[PDB]
Amino acid sequence: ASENIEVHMLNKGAEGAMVFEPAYIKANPGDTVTFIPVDKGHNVESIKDMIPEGAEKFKSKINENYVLTVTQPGAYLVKCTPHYAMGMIALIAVGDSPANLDQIVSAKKPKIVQERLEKVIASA
Ligand SMILES: [Cu+2]
């Protein structure tokens, strides 16, 4: 059956300011990821060219609880729209050996984002 993973959106966490906790989410097709705005001022949005081919773009409203159903295998880099430049991202890995992970790692993104992404992947 289907699993749900809860993610908190915070002003401050273990990795510093403006964080998703956890920032690495492992899931399977059909699972849900529930994004909880523990602190105000956050949302979640897919990043262009950093979700699998065939997955639908998504953008939640600031300060709303948002439930994402993941269907397409692969890796997804998501941001908090206001805080992307401050490093507020999460990586969702759906299925084994996501085919687009190396592409996401090599994609153009802000330096602080890339540093956090590298730490996330190492914590895998
Ligand atoms: Cu934010």
Swiss-Prot record:
**Induction info:** Under anaerobic growth conditions and by nitrite.
Named from the GO MF annotations, one term is: copper ion binding
State where the protein is found: Periplasm
Primary residence: periplasm
Question: Which keywords has UniProt assigned to this entry?
Answer: Copper, Electron transport, Metal-binding, Periplasm, Signal, Transport
The record describes how the cofactor is bound as:
Binds 1 copper ion per subunit.
Looking at the keywords, is Transcription regulation present? no
Q: Which GO terms describe its cellular component?
A: periplasmic space
Q: What does this protein do?
A: This soluble electron transfer copper protein is required for the inactivation of copper-containing nitrite reductase in the presence of oxygen. Serves as a direct electron donor to the nitrite reductase.
* Protein name, UniProt field: Pseudoazurin
This protein's species is Alcaligenes faecalis
Fragment boundaries within the full protein? 24 to 145 of 146
